[PDB]
Design a protein around this nucleic acid. Structure first.
Ligand SMILES: [Mg+2]
Ligand SMILES: [Mg+2]
Ligand SMILES: [Mg+2]
Ligand SMILES: [Mg+2]
Ligand SMILES: [Zn+2]
Lengths: 117, 24, 98, 60, 155, 206
RNA sequence: CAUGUGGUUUAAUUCGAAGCAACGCGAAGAACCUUACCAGGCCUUGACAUGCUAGGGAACCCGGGUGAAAGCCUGGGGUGCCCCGCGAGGGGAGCCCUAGCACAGGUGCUGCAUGGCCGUCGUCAGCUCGUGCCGUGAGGUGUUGGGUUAAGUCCCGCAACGAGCGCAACCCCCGCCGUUAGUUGCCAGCGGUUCGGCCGGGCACUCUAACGGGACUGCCCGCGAAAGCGGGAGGAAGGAGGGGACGACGUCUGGUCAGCAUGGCCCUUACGGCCUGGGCGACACACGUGCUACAAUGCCCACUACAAAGCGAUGCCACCCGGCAACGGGGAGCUAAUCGCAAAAAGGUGGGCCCAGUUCGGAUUGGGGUCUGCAACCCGACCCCAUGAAGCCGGAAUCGCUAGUAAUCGCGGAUCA
């Protein structure tokens, strides 16, 4: 906006520092301003801190989980490796595939194989 | 002697003039 | 020939009334020396804060009494009527003499 | 003797060496500035209020 | 202060010879903030130097302050709750400070009437190897080697 | 604490004199002396409509007695009788050219002196001291303000030991100049003693 | 020795403040004034406000007896306004004497009954709120942690994310410069000149204020993840440039009813009011903050030079005469960057002093004078002559300040005869 004329260099870089940290974490959450119908996680043990929130909020719990996990506190479990890009990719790809498949226009999976190595 | 009742700075400190201090 | 004194407090109000006269006199008459600020005589009053005993932390004020001089030469009839009608003083006690 | 005194201060019956200074506002016996005619106390009170023209907060 | 070391005050170099050590001496002489007075008083002795000996007041001043420069001193210090008179090297600045200082005092010690002559005669004995200020220096260094036993705590 | 009066603090920059006018070193006292008794009589027989900023202007026999009021409907009476007789009593004891320029108040809730004198009266009328302050501060903030603060002090209700009820909301940076925070002192007579009142309304900026 | 205080004394020697933060504090001006205390003389609806009735009188001006003053007692002048009335008279708005009631008034207590204002921890770096989370709960969390900072400042981190009162930052003074205005100053430029920027003349300069600019770890190099730190250049000034104002939630049953407001209390021919005189100034003593010295880096005499800030029309006094002098008589300028207090002092030049209870030191005391004020015994201040005391750098202990600071030397202002 043409409102940048004001605001001294002080508020400038600071407000820009605001945008930087704001996107540093929120990028991927702001897209929805309502309580998600469910939650998907890579390791229910580590991010169990969130699991509790969804659990207390009656939000269904689905998540890929390694042996280092607590399956009893997960609604729909996803057993298997987790500390490997290989295992995580195969699951996340096919999972999101079900999302677009039930949505419309089944596209090709995102370029992950290249990032893997 | 800023206290001498008969000197230069004697009256100067006392804010006065008199004889020993020049006066019109 | 004529000389005008513009004593007053607030220099903001003094600046407006002084500049006003400068435009009025010059734009409707001969030459006029601009606003001439003089050494502002100030009444610095110091005093204690608390009512009882407190020979410290005392508070003090100051009375800003400004001064501004403006000289008009040739006595123009246009400038006399201009300053006699188009004027907007207030807290500015002015005094004029030949 | 507070009331009868503030009245006597404005009397000046005998010699002039009795017309001592006397604050107007709260009528103080001392600390009466001649310029303002007020006491130091009521002086600052008004100053904060802004009822004292040209009297701004001193700072230097 | 507890934070910074606080840097020294770089004084103005001599306005006649060109040397900071000299001006610093004027400051020690300076009573009640009268530099120009003390300056002349110093240069008065400088002329008294050439009167007695054909020697330049410059080196006569260096020789004096040099022979009055305390090499070591004893400093008090606590340890669990006891003070030890531990000796050790002094800082070059402090040495210069004490030297210039003691001399000024040693001049005051003299019976001489005028201040200049006091500074004059004192600067002679100091440059020599025996004077009021010099002996006070010799005294302090004794304390150091005396308590050399406690020198184990160099810290 | 200390807290110098925030008005005298903004005295120079923000708000200007509640009484603006020049005077020579000759009669400044006498001028301000009569200037005082004026505003005093106004506070007396005019507090009815709830006056606040009793602005004053003088220069030479001219005195613009501008008086801000919550509702000038009472200061004028009907057509022109209350206001007229007021100018009467004014110059009746004075000699200067009185000129009562009455002016309304866009919102008494955002006017500190009014908000204070308001609740201060409630306490005199025996009311819920605690919540009286709560609604007062909530009144100003919900009104349109951007900072509120109210504090009473003295025998709350009538207890022996003194006390001071603190209550406020929004922002009240009293240390800052560019704040334009109106002060609102007020008394409060009680059958058991006195009672202090304070009020702060942050509004302006830059 | 000046001044505050303790104590003692006194008819009174008014009261308050009590470690730091009471002690040159309230007092920024006690000869009666002030004054709240004491003694002697009077008033006692009063010196002030509001209201009503009653006998009388307009208002208002001057005099007298008495007195220490106050007060008491008492004589002369006088008669505006309106209505009924030609007139006479009398009524009355209003002002005043007296009698009467409601009432005034109180610096008389309670600052643990209070407001307001102020001291203080301390400009110390902190203290809290909303929501969420853990705990049966008080409560924790955030605010802790690593680094950094004048800082809860910011950065990284984290069951917390965010906000608020604070520090910061906006306003004033001093610094660098410019724009605007040139009766302050200026041969900077030129000419005249009783050579004083005096005349003309000029706004560049200094200055006078008014507005804006500049500094932002901005730029280069090293360290670092960041914030930031360090060294340098440019610059008048670098890492908040020096200084001021600003002193949070709370704290101290902190201070003040004697500034004022104010609940209650208590007195009312006196706990109120006026006067004269006395008293806060009383001194066998002790403490606090100070001033002046103990001297040759110094003291006296003469001559000479550089400030800032502030103040002044019944006030500041140029300058002239007089006196050794304070100061008096005469008398110009000045609502005052334009006249004046006004000589800044220390310093600078030349001279005397020669270590001495001293030409150091100026207390004490005798004699004589001037100014203010009705009035200087108590109890003022300053002159000139004489007097020239203690102290030759101070026990235990103890205070101040990190740069234009300490020390040191001057001037002004409020206050106010
Ligand atoms: Mg009392
Ligand atoms: Mg108490
Ligand atoms: Mg300039
Ligand atoms: Mg004699
Ligand atoms: Zn008063």
């Amino acid at each position: 906006s043409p409102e940048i004329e004001e605001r001294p260099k002080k508020e400038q870089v600071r407000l820009k520092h605001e945008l930087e940290r704001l996107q540093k974490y929120l990028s991927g959450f702001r897209l929805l301003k309502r309580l998600p119908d469910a939650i998907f996680v890579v390791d229910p043990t580590k991010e169990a801190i969130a699991v509790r929130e969804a659990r207390k909020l009656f939000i269904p719990v689905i998540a890929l989980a390694d042996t280092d996990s607590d399956p009893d506190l997960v609604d729909y479990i996803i057993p298997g490796n987790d500390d490997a890009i290989r295992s995580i990719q195969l699951i996340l790809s096919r999972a999101v595939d079900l999302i677009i498949q039930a949505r419309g226009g089944v596209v090709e999976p995102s370029p992950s194989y290249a990032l893997v190595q | 002697g800023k206290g001498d009742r008969r000197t230069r700075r004697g009256k100067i400190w006392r804010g006065t003039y008199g004889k020993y201090r020049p006066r019109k | 020939k004529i000389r005008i004194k513009l004593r007053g407090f607030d220099h903001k109000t003094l600046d407006a009334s002084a500049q006003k006269i400068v435009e009025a006199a010059r734009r409707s008459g001969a030459q006029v020396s601009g606003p001439i600020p003089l050494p502002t005589r100030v009444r610095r009053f110091t005093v204690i804060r608390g009512p009882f005993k407190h020979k410290d932390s005392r508070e003090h004020f100051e009375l800003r009494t400004h001064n501004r001089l403006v000289d008009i030469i040739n006595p123009n009839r246009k400038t006399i009527e201009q300053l006699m009608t188009l004027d907007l003083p207030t807290g500015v006690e002015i005094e004029i003499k030949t | 003797a507070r009331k009868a005194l503030i009245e006597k201060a404005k009397r000046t019956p005998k010699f002039k060496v009795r017309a001592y200074t006397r604050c107007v506002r709260c009528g103080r016996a001392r600390s009466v500035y001649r310029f303002f005619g007020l006491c130091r106390i009521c002086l600052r009170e008004l100053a904060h209020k802004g009822q004292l023209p040209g009297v701004r907060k001193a700072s230097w | 202060a507890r934070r910074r070391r606080a840097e020294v005050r770089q004084l103005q170099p001599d306005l006649v010879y060109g040397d900071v050590l000299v001006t610093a001496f004027i400051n020690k002489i300076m009573r009640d903030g009268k530099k120009n007075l003390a300056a002349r008083i110093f240069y008065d002795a400088c002329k008294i130097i050439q009167e007695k000996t054909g020697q330049e007041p410059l080196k006569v001043f260096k020789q004096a302050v040099e022979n009055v420069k305390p090499r070591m001193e004893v400093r008090s210090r606590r340890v669990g709750g006891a003070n030890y008179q531990v000796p050790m090297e002094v800082s070059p600045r402090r040495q210069q400070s004490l030297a210039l200082r003691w001399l000024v005092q040693a001049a005051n010690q003299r019976p001489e009437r005028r201040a200049a002559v006091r500074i004059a005669h004192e600067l002679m004995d100091a440059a020599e190897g025996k004077g009021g200020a010099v002996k006070k220096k010799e005294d302090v260094e004794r304390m150091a080697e005396a308590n050399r036993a406690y020198a184990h705590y160099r810290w | 604490g200390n807290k110098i009066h925030p008005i005298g603090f903004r005295l120079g920059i923000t708000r200007d004199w509640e009484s603006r006018w020049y005077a020579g070193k000759k009669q400044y006292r006498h001028l301000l002396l009569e200037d005082q008794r004026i505003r005093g009589l106004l506070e007396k027989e005019l507090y009815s409509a709830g006056l606040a900023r009793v602005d004053i202007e003088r220069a030479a026999d001219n005195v613009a007695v501008t008086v801000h009021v919550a509702k000038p409907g009472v200061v004028i009476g009907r057509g022109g009788e209350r206001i007229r007789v007021l100018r009467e009593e004014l110059a009746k004891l004075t000699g200067k050219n009185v000129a009562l320029n009455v002016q309304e108040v866009q919102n008494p809730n955002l006017s500190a002196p009014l908000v204070a004198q308001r609740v201060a009266e409630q306490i005199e009328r025996r009311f819920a001291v605690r919540r009286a302050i709560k609604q007062a501060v909530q009144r100003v903030m919900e009104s349109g303000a951007k900072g509120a603060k109210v504090i009473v002090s003295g025998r709350i209700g009538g207890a022996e030991q003194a006390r001071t009820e603190w209550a406020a909301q929004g922002r009240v940076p009293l240390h800052t100049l560019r704040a334009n925070i109106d002060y609102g002192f007020a008394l409060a007579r009680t059958t058991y003693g006195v009672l202090g009142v304070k009020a702060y309304i942050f509004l302006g900026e830059v």
